[PDB]
Amino acid sequence: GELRVGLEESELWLRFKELTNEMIVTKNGRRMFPVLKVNVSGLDPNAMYSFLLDFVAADNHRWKYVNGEWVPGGKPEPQAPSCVYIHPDSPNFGAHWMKAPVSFSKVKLTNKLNGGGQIMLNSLHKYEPRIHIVRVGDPQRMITSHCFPETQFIAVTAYQNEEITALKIKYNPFAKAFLDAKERS
Amino acid sequence: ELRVGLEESELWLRFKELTNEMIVTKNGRRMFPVLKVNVSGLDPNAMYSFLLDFVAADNHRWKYVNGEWVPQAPSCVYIHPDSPNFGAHWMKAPVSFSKVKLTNKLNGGGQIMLNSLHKYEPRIHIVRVGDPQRMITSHCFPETQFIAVTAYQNEEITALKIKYNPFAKAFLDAKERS
DNA sequence: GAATTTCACACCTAGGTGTGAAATTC
DNA sequence: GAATTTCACACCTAGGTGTGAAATTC
Ligand code: NA
């Protein structure tokens, strides 16, 4: 159709996804890396929208890193998608959302109910980021949802795959101290 | 019904008594203290934007002579970054203009150009988004008057800045050490 | 000269990284 | 016993302070 939400920097995302991506969750909440950013077109420049982010459980079980490989390791469990995170620019005009990429750089993932906007995930479960565009002031309350398969990841309390850790060190600026340390060897 | 009151007024008057001063720089300088207001009496479900500008507090240039201050169009506006937003949001917690930058030359976004050694009064405006009538409220805060400067001149003001602005903790610590 | 502005600087606030040892968990 | 979670730590990014010598204006 006319509404288009495209993943930005999809090739960085794909490098993580080849290895099976992992996202740290902590007690106090952990930012994602890479950050989910999208390009939006086809909105009404003059309408009002809010952007929401939640995380759909990518399957019905859990996951285990056994001998350098991820292994389905659970008996089936229920349904729940996560709570929602509201993009901080919400609410805003379509034109604002279309002028630059919509970046969810401040969402924090956690493994505990204490949500200052934090998204509680279940460790060792796999998730698929999903973005909702909510039209504000609409008597029909129209909402459109987009999933981003290349951003799937497994929530962990510590990195399992050492190749993931290396990629995170390579590209996340807040991890630069470990990057420079590897270039020292 | 619509009320907009100054937050942390007593920290402002401590500055006000000494004649308050705000640094401007080429790029842009944050205010200290930060202007924060409480809002009540908005429609919780209506959409509003909050705007900030600065009005001339008098007609004189100023200069500092032996420990005393002796003896102009409105500034551009700064839109609070939470705009646009529901009345509920503006009312749930103080509205704080913590990221506005005061400058002597516009060279970037989020900046208000003032002209140095003049006295200015902050003014806040509220507008309803989509209001078919062109309707604005304005709210002045004489307690927050100040003189723009490129360097502090009353040493007593600098002392208060160092005492209360957390980003100047290195100079507070230093003086405690001496 | 005297008055006002710019600047590089040291030192903070504020907060995001993975590490690795220890605690917890089943 | 061993998988999972916790958490104090060093080391970053990012950027807000006043300072004082230097530059600019007057
Ligand atoms: Na400027």
XYZ file of C-alpha atoms (C1' of nucleotides) and ligand atoms in Angstrom:
416
model
C 0.000 0.000 0.000
C 1.027 3.608 0.607
C 2.071 3.392 4.257
C 5.625 2.007 4.331
C 7.773 1.325 7.397
C 11.270 0.147 6.400
C 14.011 -1.145 8.673
C 17.051 1.125 8.718
C 20.587 -0.329 8.704
C 19.136 -3.733 7.899
C 22.561 -5.125 6.998
C 24.017 -4.577 10.473
C 20.892 -6.298 11.845
C 21.430 -9.203 9.442
C 25.000 -9.791 10.717
C 23.586 -10.311 14.206
C 20.661 -12.386 12.953
C 22.926 -14.890 11.115
C 24.461 -15.808 14.479
C 21.049 -15.770 16.217
C 20.854 -12.346 17.877
C 20.979 -11.843 21.657
C 19.851 -8.932 23.851
C 21.015 -8.495 27.428
C 18.290 -7.912 30.006
C 19.139 -6.631 33.490
C 17.375 -5.711 36.706
C 17.555 -1.991 35.897
C 16.876 -2.340 32.184
C 19.204 -2.543 29.207
C 19.206 -0.657 25.941
C 19.091 -2.624 22.725
C 21.980 -2.908 20.340
C 21.563 -2.491 17.473
C 18.856 0.141 17.992
C 15.573 -0.300 16.122
C 15.263 2.539 13.572
C 12.689 2.731 10.755
C 11.886 4.883 7.724
C 8.235 5.930 7.474
C 6.429 7.198 4.408
C 2.802 7.417 3.372
C 1.441 9.000 6.527
C -0.817 12.044 6.473
C 1.633 14.918 7.127
C -1.008 16.771 9.114
C -2.537 13.958 11.147
C -1.391 13.033 14.642
C 0.192 9.683 15.463
C 1.872 7.842 18.296
C 4.509 5.154 17.686
C 4.544 2.162 20.029
C 7.030 -0.704 20.268
C 6.364 -4.142 21.712
C 7.938 -7.587 21.394
C 6.029 -10.630 20.125
C 7.154 -14.053 21.334
C 8.688 -15.632 18.261
C 7.678 -19.169 19.278
C 5.933 -21.091 22.039
C 8.899 -22.506 23.971
C 12.286 -21.491 25.343
C 15.859 -21.758 24.180
C 19.122 -23.149 25.469
C 22.691 -22.695 24.255
C 24.045 -26.264 24.310
C 27.520 -26.946 22.882
C 27.786 -23.763 20.829
C 24.304 -24.144 19.302
C 20.854 -22.895 20.222
C 18.492 -25.714 21.101
C 14.696 -25.635 21.478
C 14.474 -26.600 25.124
C 11.007 -26.097 26.571
C 7.589 -27.517 26.602
C 4.986 -25.189 25.067
C 3.907 -22.112 27.038
C 1.281 -19.359 26.514
C 0.792 -16.230 24.516
C 1.686 -12.858 25.981
C 3.353 -10.179 23.887
C 5.198 -7.678 26.038
C 4.073 -4.366 27.384
C 4.387 -1.443 25.002
C 7.011 1.255 24.873
C 5.827 4.649 23.647
C 8.286 6.452 21.439
C 9.306 9.645 23.316
C 8.312 11.861 20.375
C 4.677 10.722 20.750
C 2.230 12.219 19.993
C 3.330 14.007 16.857
C 2.405 14.971 13.327
C 2.921 12.582 10.463
C 5.403 15.065 8.987
C 7.662 14.818 12.031
C 7.653 11.025 11.847
C 8.456 11.049 8.138
C 11.213 13.682 8.170
C 13.929 11.523 9.762
C 14.229 7.880 10.835
C 12.178 6.918 13.878
C 14.724 5.586 16.345
C 13.890 3.614 19.476
C 17.259 4.223 21.067
C 16.085 4.603 24.651
C 13.822 1.578 25.155
C 15.165 -0.576 27.975
C 14.689 -4.340 28.291
C 14.478 -5.902 31.742
C 13.643 -9.205 33.422
C 11.505 -7.717 36.188
C 8.172 -5.974 36.574
C 9.282 -2.407 37.384
C 8.327 -0.515 34.292
C 9.390 3.094 34.004
C 8.515 2.384 30.400
C 10.785 -0.666 30.636
C 9.836 -3.786 28.702
C 9.879 -6.968 30.764
C 11.044 -9.960 28.733
C 11.517 -13.618 29.665
C 15.148 -14.681 29.646
C 16.048 -17.346 27.071
C 12.925 -16.637 25.029
C 13.022 -15.389 21.439
C 11.213 -12.184 20.456
C 10.329 -10.173 17.312
C 10.150 -6.339 17.630
C 6.830 -4.933 16.418
C 5.921 -1.293 15.809
C 2.373 0.088 16.116
C 1.400 3.412 14.532
C -1.618 4.762 16.459
C -3.625 7.561 14.832
C -4.475 10.106 17.551
C -7.991 11.523 17.886
C -9.502 8.922 15.551
C -13.034 7.769 16.445
C -12.103 4.517 14.659
C -8.858 4.274 16.654
C -6.999 3.032 13.614
C -3.742 1.228 14.378
C -1.265 -0.335 11.952
C 1.318 -2.912 13.078
C 4.586 -3.881 11.394
C 6.935 -6.700 12.415
C 10.665 -6.722 11.709
C 11.924 -10.291 11.194
C 15.531 -9.338 10.769
C 15.564 -7.889 14.334
C 14.509 -11.109 16.097
C 16.615 -11.937 19.114
C 16.760 -14.087 22.225
C 16.685 -12.354 25.594
C 19.623 -13.394 27.803
C 21.174 -12.272 31.082
C 24.658 -12.871 29.642
C 25.871 -13.407 26.107
C 25.881 -17.081 25.143
C 27.456 -16.917 21.679
C 30.902 -15.323 21.784
C 30.510 -14.230 18.150
C 27.577 -12.034 19.210
C 29.679 -10.445 21.976
C 32.387 -9.638 19.422
C 29.891 -7.931 17.086
C 28.458 -5.920 19.984
C 31.963 -4.835 20.993
C 32.757 -3.977 17.374
C 29.834 -1.594 16.720
C 28.319 -0.356 20.023
C 30.188 2.876 20.950
C 29.559 2.389 24.649
C 31.668 -0.790 24.418
C 34.626 0.978 22.777
C 36.949 0.266 25.724
C 36.762 -3.435 24.894
C 37.288 -2.701 21.188
C 40.473 -0.709 21.801
C 41.637 -3.484 24.160
C 41.334 -6.059 21.363
C 43.268 -3.771 19.019
C 45.949 -3.640 21.728
C 46.589 -7.405 21.447
C -8.778 28.144 36.028
C -5.590 27.853 33.941
C -2.771 28.442 36.455
C 0.963 28.396 35.737
C 3.152 28.748 38.832
C 6.917 28.987 39.170
C 8.659 25.893 40.535
C 11.563 26.242 42.985
C 10.878 29.965 43.408
C 13.161 30.295 46.439
C 16.256 29.218 44.490
C 15.305 31.848 41.923
C 14.959 34.661 44.457
C 18.370 33.846 45.957
C 19.696 34.642 42.489
C 17.231 37.475 41.938
C 18.367 39.437 45.013
C 21.944 39.694 43.755
C 20.785 40.608 40.256
C 20.776 37.240 38.431
C 23.078 36.619 35.450
C 22.923 34.037 32.635
C 25.967 33.139 30.519
C 25.457 33.183 26.767
C 28.062 31.676 24.449
C 28.624 31.446 20.717
C 27.040 27.996 20.439
C 24.571 28.132 23.306
C 24.468 27.939 27.088
C 21.973 26.210 29.323
C 20.228 28.285 31.953
C 20.897 27.817 35.646
C 18.607 27.733 37.500
C 16.399 25.922 35.000
C 12.955 27.432 34.413
C 10.287 24.999 35.687
C 6.548 25.628 35.987
C 3.472 23.848 37.325
C 0.366 23.849 35.152
C -3.243 23.238 36.136
C -6.585 23.901 34.532
C -5.822 22.578 31.068
C -8.251 20.235 29.359
C -6.646 16.819 30.068
C -7.555 15.459 26.639
C -6.851 18.518 24.502
C -3.572 18.924 22.619
C -1.229 21.813 23.508
C 2.239 23.135 22.783
C 4.324 25.143 25.252
C 6.563 27.954 23.951
C 9.255 30.004 25.676
C 10.619 33.422 24.810
C 12.367 36.293 26.539
C 11.143 39.877 26.801
C 13.166 42.998 27.607
C 12.913 43.838 31.290
C 14.006 47.447 30.741
C 15.499 49.735 28.106
C 19.033 50.246 29.493
C 22.233 48.513 28.615
C 24.098 47.475 31.742
C 27.654 47.322 33.001
C 29.211 46.180 36.268
C 31.192 48.888 38.115
C 32.949 48.198 41.466
C 30.530 45.554 42.766
C 27.346 47.260 41.532
C 25.120 47.119 38.435
C 24.530 50.472 36.719
C 22.714 51.442 33.449
C 14.940 45.986 22.717
C 12.822 43.512 20.714
C 11.502 40.147 21.965
C 13.640 37.068 21.395
C 12.816 34.186 19.090
C 10.768 31.335 20.557
C 11.791 27.937 21.869
C 9.216 25.159 21.637
C 9.329 22.835 24.618
C 10.518 19.465 23.226
C 7.526 17.611 24.698
C 5.214 19.577 22.341
C 2.662 18.744 21.068
C 1.086 16.916 23.984
C -2.061 16.287 25.978
C -3.046 18.607 28.799
C -2.743 15.592 31.106
C 0.949 15.272 30.219
C 1.697 18.956 30.834
C -0.115 18.801 34.162
C 1.253 15.513 35.542
C 4.666 16.962 36.474
C 6.470 20.323 36.307
C 7.175 21.594 32.790
C 10.916 22.136 32.690
C 12.816 24.047 29.997
C 16.078 22.372 30.860
C 17.558 22.105 27.360
C 17.006 25.605 25.924
C 20.342 27.203 25.024
C 21.002 30.930 25.364
C 23.381 32.375 22.793
C 24.603 35.646 21.332
C 24.323 34.290 17.773
C 21.895 31.797 16.244
C 23.952 28.940 14.796
C 21.882 25.858 15.581
C 18.581 24.511 16.794
C 17.034 24.941 20.219
C 18.675 28.340 20.658
C 17.498 31.732 21.883
C 19.630 34.692 20.880
C 19.947 37.389 23.509
C 22.113 40.476 23.375
C 24.749 40.685 26.063
C 24.552 42.975 29.108
C 20.771 43.415 28.793
C 18.103 42.366 31.282
C 15.512 39.835 30.116
C 12.345 38.307 31.536
C 11.251 34.759 30.598
C 7.736 34.436 29.185
C 5.858 31.174 28.627
C 3.035 30.697 26.121
C 0.439 27.918 25.742
C -1.453 27.256 22.492
C -4.063 24.608 21.681
C -3.043 22.551 18.628
C -5.688 22.767 15.913
C -7.482 25.688 17.643
C -9.401 27.442 14.843
C -9.150 30.673 16.834
C -5.651 32.115 17.034
C -5.492 31.971 20.842
C -2.409 32.256 23.047
C -1.830 32.596 26.726
C 1.277 34.248 28.111
C 2.786 34.015 31.573
C 5.644 36.188 32.824
C 7.973 35.364 35.725
C 9.639 38.494 37.160
C 11.377 36.299 39.753
C 13.451 34.820 36.896
C 14.727 38.088 35.454
C 18.412 38.125 34.648
C 21.126 39.941 32.739
C 22.789 38.167 29.837
C 26.596 38.136 30.052
C 29.484 36.358 28.380
C 31.237 36.110 31.752
C 29.985 36.420 35.300
C 30.566 39.837 36.869
C 29.115 39.633 40.397
C 31.346 37.054 42.103
C 28.461 36.376 44.506
C 26.396 35.005 41.621
C 29.221 32.695 40.521
C 29.314 31.385 44.090
C 25.619 30.479 43.896
C 26.077 28.864 40.462
C 28.928 26.739 41.824
C 26.926 25.941 44.950
C 23.809 24.640 43.203
C 24.545 23.719 39.563
C 25.676 20.053 39.716
C 27.753 20.459 36.567
C 29.995 22.950 38.461
C 30.718 20.460 41.276
C 34.437 20.489 40.426
C 34.683 24.106 41.582
C 32.629 23.443 44.695
C 34.794 20.612 45.631
C 37.870 22.686 44.969
C 36.828 25.450 47.199
C 35.891 23.057 49.949
C 39.437 21.686 49.650
C 41.022 25.060 49.888
C 44.081 51.366 28.260
C 39.562 49.462 29.565
C 35.659 46.590 28.487
C 33.807 42.693 26.625
C 34.215 38.260 24.100
C 36.386 33.781 22.699
C 38.718 29.661 23.649
C 41.282 25.357 25.162
C 41.171 23.213 29.281
C 40.523 20.302 33.578
C 36.926 18.363 35.984
C 32.760 17.237 36.789
C 27.648 14.931 35.958
C 25.151 11.398 33.839
C 24.923 7.086 32.149
C 25.931 2.992 28.717
C 29.301 -1.114 27.922
C 31.127 -6.182 28.863
C 33.959 -8.574 32.470
C 34.410 -11.973 35.804
C 33.813 -13.507 40.280
C 30.240 -14.681 43.146
C 25.489 -15.584 44.273
C 21.570 -17.714 43.062
C 18.657 -21.299 41.029
C 16.606 -26.075 39.972
C 26.640 -29.978 39.762
C 25.912 -26.881 36.566
C 22.957 -23.441 34.210
C 21.430 -18.927 35.024
C 21.431 -14.434 37.227
C 23.623 -10.799 39.852
C 26.585 -6.898 40.605
C 30.720 -4.080 41.748
C 34.207 -2.533 38.663
C 37.083 -0.171 35.109
C 36.533 2.184 30.916
C 34.103 4.253 27.704
C 30.669 8.062 25.241
C 28.493 12.447 25.713
C 28.385 16.798 27.166
C 27.644 20.748 31.019
C 30.741 23.708 34.237
C 33.732 27.942 35.447
C 38.624 29.380 34.779
C 42.153 32.316 33.092
C 45.163 33.535 29.292
C 44.373 35.395 24.823
C 41.811 37.743 21.486
C 38.600 41.098 20.178
C 36.244 45.529 20.378
C 35.470 50.069 22.317
Na 24.477 30.081 19.003
